[PDB]
Ligand binder design. Structure first.
Ligand SMILES: CNC(=O)c1cc(Oc2ccc(NC(=O)Nc3cc(C(C)(C)C)nn3-c3ccc4ncccc4c3)c(F)c2)ccn1
Length: 258
């Protein structure tokens, strides 16, 4: 019942200024409803759809349908008007997108991640560039496969593997060890991204030197205007030992009872 017919969608523009891969603005003509359309090798492409069929949460991206074993193949997703969170923060009116709205943003992502934690999913690339902003500041967690779509300024090699270095937990850099706790660390950086209205992490520091810095216990400074308690949440997310890091259940609770 997920199967749609290609011709029921009118295809329009490339999303994200054309830096988010083969994903388009489209319209489900029957409902006059704007949708996002991922277009197409096929076995990875089909496995994405399968995963997304088992994802239902208000702060996670929502499959609407697929067009299958015929090219072009589509994955059709509910449309998020305002696009990615990174660019959103960077270009927003900060009286409208004020500290309350920043908090509401973080609280939404932690709910999404609480849900992924319960489902034993590991995201592996959490960051503001992978979050979507819709009407009334609704935020949804997504995965655009950006490691194949971006450059060495964001994704590059550490010890012979490719990483989004400045979002990557130390044990993942050192052992290719990925877990829900490596996603917590990433969440830490994403909280810093939100609080800075989309500043790049470790400003001015080359991706080359990040691991050694962390290892000597350096972490990023408290952003301007960020409450001490939210900063300590970042610092909790960035414990060297993944065991010492809070669960997403724990983080969500902290926002709830602030
Ligand atoms: C203006 N509006 C817009 O720009 C706009 C654009 C928009 O486009 C898309 C957004 C999200 C996706 N897809 C995903 O998010 N995939 C995903 C989620 C997860 C989770 C659920 C596990 C996080 N795992 N994987 C996921 C799973 C397997 C994968 N295998 C290979 C590659 C990637 C993969 C990703 C997409 F295809 C298109 C939607 C709404 N608005």
């Amino acid at each position: 019942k997920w199967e749609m017919e290609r011709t029921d969608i009118t295809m329009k523009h490339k999303l994200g200024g054309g830096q988010y891969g083969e994903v388009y603005e489209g319209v489900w003509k029957k409902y006059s409803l704007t949708v996002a359309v991922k277009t197409l090798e096929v076995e990875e492409f089909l496995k994405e759809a399968a995963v997304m069929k088992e994802i239902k949460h208000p702060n996670l991206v929502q499959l609407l349908g697929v067009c299958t074993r015929e090219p072009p193949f589509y994955i059709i997703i509910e449309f998020m008007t305002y696009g990615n969170l990174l660019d959103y923060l960077r270009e927003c009116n900060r009286q409208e997108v004020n500290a309350v709205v920043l908090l509401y943003m973080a609280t939404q992502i932690s709910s999404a991640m609480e849900y992924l934690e319960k489902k034993n999913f590991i995201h592996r690339d959490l960051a503001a560039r992978n979050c979507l902003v819709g009407e009334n500041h609704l935020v949804k967690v997504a995965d655009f496969g950006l490691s194949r779509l971006m450059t060495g300024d964001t994704y590059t090699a550490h010890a012979g593997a490719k990483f989004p270095i400045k979002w990557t937990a130390p044990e993942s850099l050192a052992y290719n060890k990925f877990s829900i706790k490596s996603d917590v660390w990433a969440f830490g950086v994403l909280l810093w991204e939100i609080a800075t209205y989309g500043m790049s992490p470790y400003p001015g520091i080359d991706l080359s030197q990040v691991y050694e810095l962390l290892e000597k216990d350096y972490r990023m400074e408290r952003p301007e205007g960020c409450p001490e308690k939210v900063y300590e949440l970042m610092r909790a997310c960035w414990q060297w030992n993944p065991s010492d890091r809070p669960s997403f259940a724990e983080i969500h609770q902290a926002f709830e009872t602030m």
